[PDB]
């Protein structure tokens, strides 16, 4: 029963060298619970979960001041990286940060993460030992040398092992009804004829949490991977996710193909069939 908290920062430079758009979200076990948009007229950290709204004003004040400090820091680096790579003044660029920590069933620290990216390409990342950096080429090496000589990985480790784990345990306790829940999927199969010689069997799975689900097709007793199609696990808008898998089968042999569904909230892997 492991869990993970993740924050996602996004700073998007403007083509007119204006105020970049800063959007920040936080997820505890695939569940968003906070947000911060520089475009919204509130300019404060907003709640997105019921269990997180119980926090005091000193919480939201500290989270807003720290999320604003990183937004102002990313803005300076945006203009610096724009002049480093001689990028156009009329262009838009993006800086992204991802940090978080993983806890086990006992609530103790397991893994920590801290990685940055510029224009969709990796910039600098904190390794698993939380004492060394892995940087890309050019500007990332300058950041690596700057952060190594400043012992930056030390203070990054203190958060991932202390404040991150402490608040993750608190979130999992105040939101145990939703964070530690396991909604099993509601599965059914459909039939979609292509022509008079072929047909498509689509195996659905709706309303499940967490999003970790494995849909597999099998012709007779062997694994069938040819002429199959899986779609990305899509959300539904109510905290649950959706996913389906299809297979092109010859007409008349639909009962030879069996859909197998594996989910964390299921007592035993399911097996769907029929046309």
């Amino acid at each position: 029963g492991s869990h993970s908290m993740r924050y996602f920062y996004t700073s998007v430079s403007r083509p007119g060298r204006g105020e970049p758009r800063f959007i920040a979200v936080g997820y505890v076990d695939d569940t968003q619970f906070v947000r911060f948009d520089s475009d919204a007229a509130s300019q404060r950290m907003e709640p997105r979960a019921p269990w997180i709204e119980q926090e005091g004003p000193e919480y939201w004040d500290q989270e807003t001041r720290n999320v604003k400090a990183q937004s102002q820091t990313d803005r300076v680096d945006l203009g610096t990286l724009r002049g480093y790579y001689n990028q156009s003044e009329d262009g838009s660029h993006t800086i992204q940060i991802m940090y978080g920590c993983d806890v086990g069933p006992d609530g103790r620290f397991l893994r920590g993460y801290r990685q940055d990216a510029y224009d969709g390409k990796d910039y600098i990342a904190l390794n698993e030992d939380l004492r060394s950096w892995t940087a890309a080429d050019m500007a990332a090496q300058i950041t690596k040398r700057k952060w190594e000589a400043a012992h930056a990985a030390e203070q990054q480790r203190a958060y991932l092992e202390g404040r991150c784990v402490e608040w993750l345990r608190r979130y999992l306790e105040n939101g145990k009804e939703t964070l530690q829940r396991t909604d099993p999927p509601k599965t059914h199969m459909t039939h979609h004829p292509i022509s008079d010689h072929e047909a498509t069997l689509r195996c659905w799975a709706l309303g499940f949490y967490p999003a970790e689900i494995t849909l597999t097709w099998q012709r007779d007793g062997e694994d069938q991977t040819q002429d199959t199609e899986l779609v990305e696990t899509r959300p539904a808008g109510d905290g649950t996710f959706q996913k389906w898998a299809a297979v092109v089968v010859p007409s008349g042999e639909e009962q030879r193909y069996t859909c197998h569904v594996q989910h964390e909230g299921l007592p035993k892997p399911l097996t769907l069939r029929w046309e």
Partner: peptide
């Protein structure tokens, strides 16, 4: 909670 030690790149 969010990260408190803000690091400046470059």
């Amino acid at each position: 909670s969010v990260l408190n030690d803000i690091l400046s790149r470059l």
